[PDB]
């Protein structure tokens, strides 16, 4: 049940892929790669980077995986151009899907809900002021098309019920994404603009932002 998948292509190789900046207030805990392009590695800030021997990737104690930037040694720039391309394809694929199963459902107030598999369209901002559940089997899909901003309120959490997988949940957000302090998010975020994860928040999924990503001692676990 649910809509056809949004293939991420090589964007699915990153916990965080951004185009303009990635910032962190230590100590973030990222499991997976962090890539930035076409901005240079100087737009990865707060990571206390160490450039590795080849000059093609760097490391941070805040990242289990490699960081890469557009200015790093061949072949890292080419890798990242293809990843950024694949992110753009993915975002457009998800944003342009027709025939939603849910239209303006709950006026975009997801607190206390249990969301069944489907394509969801809101011509609005979406938010949750209370915990909510995404409920379906390990093979069910969700696409959340959001024309406005996406938020998740401080300390609030998204629960997976029924065997639902984060990698099967796609948030396609045109507006800014703000995950408030201590909140726990589930899903892949295909963001047209900025994404922010505030102090002690967590996300199981990926952050694929066409502008900036801002972390504040945040946990990002690739799914």
Residue numbers in the entry: 1 to 223
Task: Kindly provide excerpts from the paper associated with this entry.
Antifreeze proteins (AFPs) inhibit ice growth by adsorbing onto specific ice planes. To probe the molecular mechanisms responsible for AFP activity, we here characterized the antifreeze activity and crystal structure of TisAFP7 from the snow mold fungus Typhula ishikariensis. TisAFP7 exhibited intermediate activity, with the ability to bind the basal plane, compared with a hyperactive isoform TisAFP8 and a moderately active isoform TisAFP6. The structure is dominated by a right-handed β-helical domain, a typical DUF3494 structure.
The crystal structure of TisAFP7 was determined at 1.54 Å resolution by a molecular replacement method. The crystal belongs to the orthorhombic space group P212121, with unit cell parameters of a = 57.12 Å, b = 62.99 Å, and c = 101.21 Å, with two molecules in an asymmetrical unit. The final structure was refined with R factor of 0.195 and Free R factor of 0.229, and was composed of 446 (223 × 2) residues and 746 solvent molecules. Analysis of the TisAFP7 crystal structure revealed a bound-water network arranged in a zigzag pattern on the surface of the protein’s ice-binding site (IBS). Among the approximately 54 waters molecules on IBS, six water molecules were aligned in a small trough formed by the inward-facing hydrophobic residues (Val22, Val213, Val195, Val177, Leu150, and Val126) at the β-sheet region of IBS. The interval between water molecules 3 and 6 was 14.51 Å, which closely matched that between the water molecules in a prism ice plane (4.6 Å and 14.7 Å). To survey the bound water structure in the IBS loop region in detail, we next compared the structure of TisAFP7 with those of TisAFP6 and TisAFP8. In all these isoforms, 12 water molecules in corresponding positions formed a zigzag-pattern network with branches, shown by red spheres in Fig. 6a. The average distance between the comprising water molecules and the nearest carbon atom of the interior aromatic side chain was 3.4 Å, which implies that these water molecules were constrained to engage in hydrophobic interactions with the Phe43 side chain.
